[PDB]
Design a binder for this molecule. Sequence first.
Ligand SMILES: *[C@@H]1O[C@H](CO)[C@@H](O)[C@H](O)[C@H]1NC(C)=O
Ligand SMILES: [Cl-]
Ligand SMILES: [Cl-]
Ligand SMILES: [Cl-]
Ligand SMILES: [Cu+2]
Length: 235
Amino acid sequence: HTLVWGVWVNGVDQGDGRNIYIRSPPNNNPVKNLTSPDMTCNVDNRVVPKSVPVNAGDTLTFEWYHNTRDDDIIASSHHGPIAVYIAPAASNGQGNVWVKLFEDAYNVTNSTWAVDRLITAHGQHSVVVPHVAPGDYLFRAEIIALHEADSLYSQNPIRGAQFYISCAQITINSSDDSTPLPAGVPFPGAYTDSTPGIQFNIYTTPATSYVAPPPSVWSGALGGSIAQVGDASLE
Ligand SMILES: *[C@@H]1O[C@H](CO)[C@@H](O)[C@H](O)[C@H]1NC(C)=O
Ligand SMILES: [Cl-]
Ligand SMILES: [Cl-]
Ligand SMILES: [Cl-]
Ligand SMILES: [Cu+2]
C-alpha cells in the first residue's frame, strides 16, 4: 500500500503533485485485476491540471509514501520489482503505447528486491528523460508486490500480485527527438496469468530465479536508479 507524493527534477522538488500533476487514486489500495482499465493509470484516470516541464537528459524522480510523506514508504512484506513506462499523452494510455524506460527486480550482490531498496531510498526512484519528440507524456511508475503472488487474482480474487500504479503528467520541452518513441505495449493487456513474474512464490523460489514481466527496457532509455536524490525533511 503506497502512493506517489510528487516528483523531483534534477534533484529539485517539484512540490506536492497529488491530483495536480499525478493522476492520483483516492487511496493506496492495490490494483489486482490484470484485464481492468485500472491497470492503465489506477482507478481515477483523468486529466489533472498541471504537467511537469522537463528536458531530455533530466533526472525525473518519483517519490512514494505509505500514509504520510517520507514515512515507512511501503510495508517491507511487499517484496517485488519496479518498472517505469512512458506513453504520449494523446493516447490517454490506451492502445499499444507504453514503452519501458526502467526495470529493477532482484539485486544478487545486496540480496535486495527493488521494493526493499525503495524503502531505503525514502520512496525515491528515477529515470533519465529520453530524446523523444517534445510534447505531453504520461510516465507510469509500477511497483509489483509479490507477497500473495503464489495465487492468480483471476482464480482467487482475495490473493494475487499487487500493482501500485501511478501516472505523472510530464511535458518534454527541449529534445532533439533523436530517439523517437518506438511501438508500445497495452495496459491492460501486456500482463497475463502466464506472463513471467506475475505468479511467483517468493517463500520457496530463490529470488535469483525471479524473471520480471516483459517488455524489456527500450534501448533508447537512459534511466535510472532507486536512490534518494533529495531530503524531503528539509522543507
Ligand atoms: C476484471 O476486469 C474485467 C474488465 O473490466 C471485468 O470484466 C471483471 O469483472 C473484473 N473482475 C472482477 C473480479 O471484478
Ligand atoms: Cl476504494
Ligand atoms: Cl538511497
Ligand atoms: Cl536533446
Ligand atoms: Cu499493501
